[PDB]
Design a protein around this ligand. Structure first.
Ligand SMILES: CS(=O)(=O)c1cc(NS(=O)(=O)c2cc(Br)ccc2O)cc(S(F)(F)(F)(F)F)c1
Length: 302
C-alpha cells in the first residue's frame, strides 16, 4: 500500500523563506510563519489566503495552534513569543524572557501552557493566561531545536544541536530522561500514542525511539538533512506514514513499519523546510526556503 499525494494548490505571499506550517486542530486553517516577520492564515481545503498577522520585529521560526483553534503562538528572532487571537489578528500577549532567538514553540493539549526553546539553550514554560514565565529549564548546551508536549501534556521533549534529546516532567521541570555518538538533533516530537519520540539528526537520519527503554525502534533514511531544522510528522489519517521535508527539494513519505520510502513529492524549487499533516484528511502542507517561498497543499486517497 502506497499513498498517491497529488498537488492541489500553491500558496504564494511570503516575501522571504517560509519557516513553519501548521494545520489548525479543527482542520479549517493552515498557518505559516516566515523570515519576513509575518504569519499568514490560509484555508486548508481551497488554499485561499485568509489574512496576515504582523507585529514581530524580526523573523519567525515557528508557530503553533491552541487546541480550540482560536489562538496562535509565534516564536521570533526578536527574542519574544507572541500569543495571537486568530479571529482578530490582535497580539494578546508578548512573552519575554529568552536572551536570544526563540526557535520553537507549542501549546500543551489543555492550551493553558506554552513551551519554548531558544538559541539561548533554555526551555521555558509560560502561562497562557498571564503571559508570565513559570519555569526556565537549563535544558541544553547548544541551541534548542524543538519542544513538544506529549498527548496529555504531562511531558515535554526537547532536542538540541548539542546532540541530546531530553524528556522533562512538565509539572516539576525535572529532566526524566536524556537520550545519548551525538550528531546535532534538529527536530523531535512525541508519537501519537505518546510512547515514542521521532528525532531528526543532521546526518540525514530520522529515528523512532522508545525513550523509556532507550531503544531505537525505527530508522528512516534516503533524504537529505545536514543543515536545517526540518519538521517531521506522523500521518495518522490513512496509512501510517512518516512525512518529512528534505534539502533535495522533495517531500519524503516512508512506511512507518517497514521504513521503505513510499512516495517523494516533487515540485518545490528549494529546501522543503517544513511539512504538516492534516488532522482528519489525507492532506499534506509543505513549505520551502527563499528560492521558492511558497506553501504547497497535496491530497491523497490513502
Ligand atoms: C502496530 S502499529 O502499526 O499500529 C504501530 C503503532 C505505533 N504507534 S505510533 O508511533 O504512536 C503511531 C504512528 C502512526 Br504514523 C499512527 C498511529 C500511531 O499510533 C508505532 C509502531 S512502530 F513504529 F513503533 F512499532 F516501530 F512500527 C507501530
Amino acid at each position: 500500500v502506497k499513498p498517491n499525494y497529488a498537488l492541489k494548490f500553491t500558496l504564494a505571499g511570503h516575501t522571504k523563506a517560509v519557516s513553519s506550517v501548521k494545520f489548525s486542530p479543527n482542520g479549517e486553517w493552515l498557518a505559516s510563519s516566515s523570515a519576513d516577520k509575518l504569519i499568514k492564515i490560509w484555508g486548508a481545503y481551497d488554499g485561499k489566503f485568509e489574512k496576515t498577522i504582523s507585529g514581530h520585529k524580526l523573523g519567525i521560526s515557528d508557530v503553533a495552534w491552541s487546541s480550540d483553534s482560536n489562538l496562535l503562538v509565534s516564536a521570533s528572532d526578536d527574542k519574544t513569543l507572541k500569543i495571537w487571537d486568530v479571529s482578530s489578528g490582535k497580539c494578546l500577549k508578548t512573552l519575554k524572557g529568552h536572551s536570544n532567538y526563540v526557535f520553537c514553540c507549542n501549546f500543551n493539549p489543555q492550551s493553558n501552557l506554552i513551551v519554548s526553546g531558544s538559541f539561548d539553550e533554555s526551555v521555558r514554560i509560560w502561562d497562557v493566561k498571564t503571559g508570565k514565565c513559570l519555569k526556565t529549564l537549563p535544558a541544553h548546551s547548544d541551541p534548542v531545536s524543538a519542544v513538544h508536549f506529549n498527548r496529555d501534556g504531562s511531558l515535554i521533549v526537547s532536542s538540541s544541536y548539542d546532540g541530546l534529546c531530553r524528556i522533562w516532567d512538565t509539572a516539576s521541570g525535572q529532566c526524566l530522561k536524556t537520550l545519548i555518538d551525538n550528531p546535532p538533533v534538529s527536530f523531535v516530537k512525541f508519537s501519537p500514542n505518546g510512547k515514542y519520540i521521532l528525532a531528526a539528526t543532521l546526518d540525514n537520519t530520522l529515528k523512532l525511539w522508545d525513550y523509556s527503554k532507550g531503544k531505537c525502534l525505527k530508522t528512516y533514511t534516503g533524504h537529505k538533512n545536514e543543515k536545517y531544522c526540518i519538521f517531521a510528522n506522523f500521518s495518522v489519517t490513512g496509512g501510517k506514514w512518516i512525512v518529512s521535508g528534505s534539502e533535495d527539494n522533495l517531500v519524503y513519505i516512508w512506511n512507518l513499519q517497514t521504513k521503505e520510502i513510499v512516495q517523494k513529492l516533487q515540485g518545490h524549487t528549494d529546501v522543503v523546510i517544513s511539512t504538516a499533516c492534516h488532522p482528519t484528511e489525507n492532506i499534506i502542507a509543505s513549505a520551502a526556503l527563499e528560492n521558492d517561498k511558497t506553501i504547497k497543499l497535496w491530497k491523497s486517497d490513502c
